[PDB]
């Protein structure tokens, strides 16, 4: 049963990136102010925070197996910090324009960055963070990158050019380009993580969320109801729901079978920008970042 409890919410500057640690009860937030925070959401104490830069940090992820956080900011730079010591492991210019999104491979030492420079870049931390590949083809800002968890030799990029492109690590052209019909662009793309459906999901400034079968390229469903830009939409990894968030200030939970809204939450933090789901469904935790802070919720 859906039984939504607020486990921890705190106010801060606008949070643009958010991520859960897989084994510690921690959430990373990356802020428009250039600050990043790691909170223990069970004790409600900060474990570490860093003023990384003075520009927005739009992307941030844990790399748990290396005890790192990796962040990307509007100063064009990727930085990596050890969260146990605070050491800055690396700091390099990744793109000649804003970084929108960072994804990390589940097993291999690879990080993808998507940028306003129209590209996705692949960096290898076992090769001194060498640029190993640039994926070219998109025609506007690359807003989101996500590995396919069932086949992480492939990944998806969501773009303001109104397409999603799915790529193979070996290869210079997309395996396919999805024409979303979301004419104000794609802000977010996510994969359904379970093996029973080959589904992806896209969110747009055109107020819609769409579900896609990536084998046939068909639109399975269109989810309508948000009243401003949809910043993200994701499949919960465990529960049969989809969770979206919007500049309309709401989170929406949708039934992933009927595609009808189940719950709309106004958490009171103004516009919603980002989402994380706990890597293994611990307490069904989700977390979202907003204009005025973040919240960590237990869905039941």
């Amino acid at each position: 049963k859906l039984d939504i409890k607020k486990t921890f919410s705190n106010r801060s500057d606008r949070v643009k990136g958010i991520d859960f640690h897989p084994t510690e009860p921690w959430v990373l937030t990356t802020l428009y102010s250039g600050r990043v925070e790691i909170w223990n959401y069970e004790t409600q104490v900060e474990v570490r925070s860093i003023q990384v830069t003075e520009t927005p940090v739009r992307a941030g992820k844990f790399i748990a197996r290396k005890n790192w956080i990796i962040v990307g900011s509007d100063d064009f730079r990727i930085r990596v910090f050890n969260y146990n010591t605070g050491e800055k492991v690396v700091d390099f210019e990744a793109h000649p324009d804003y970084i929108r999104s960072i994804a990390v491979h589940p097993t291999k030492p690879y990080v993808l960055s998507g940028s306003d420079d129209l590209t996705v870049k692949l960096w290898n931390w076992e090769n001194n963070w060498a640029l190993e590949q640039t994926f070219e083809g998109h025609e506007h800002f690359v807003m989101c990158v996500a590995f396919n968890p069932k086949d992480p030799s492939t990944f998806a990029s969501g773009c303001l050019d109104r397409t999603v492109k799915v790529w193979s690590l070996g290869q210079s052209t997309p395996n396919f380009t999805l024409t979303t019909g979301q004419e104000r662009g794609v802000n977010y793309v996510d994969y359904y993580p379970l093996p029973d459906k080959p589904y992806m999901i896209t969110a747009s400034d055109d107020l819609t969320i769409k579900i896609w079968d990536y084998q046939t390229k068909s639109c399975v469903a269109t989810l309508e109801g948000h009243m401003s830009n949809v910043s993200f939409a994701v499949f919960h990894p465990t529960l049969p729901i989809i969770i979206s968030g919007s500049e309309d200030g709401t989170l929406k939970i949708w039934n992933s079978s009927t595609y009808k809204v189940e719950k709309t939450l106004n958490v009171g933090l103004e516009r919603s920008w980002c989402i994380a789901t706990h890597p293994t469904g611990r307490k069904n935790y989700i977390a979202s970042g907003f204009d005025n802070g973040f919240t960590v919720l237990s869905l039941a």
């Binding site: 606008r14 428009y32 804003y98 800002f141 807003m143 303001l160 802000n187």
Partner: peptide, 6 residues
Amino acid sequence: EKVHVQ
């Protein structure tokens, strides 16, 4: 000209 600046 840059969109999504916020």
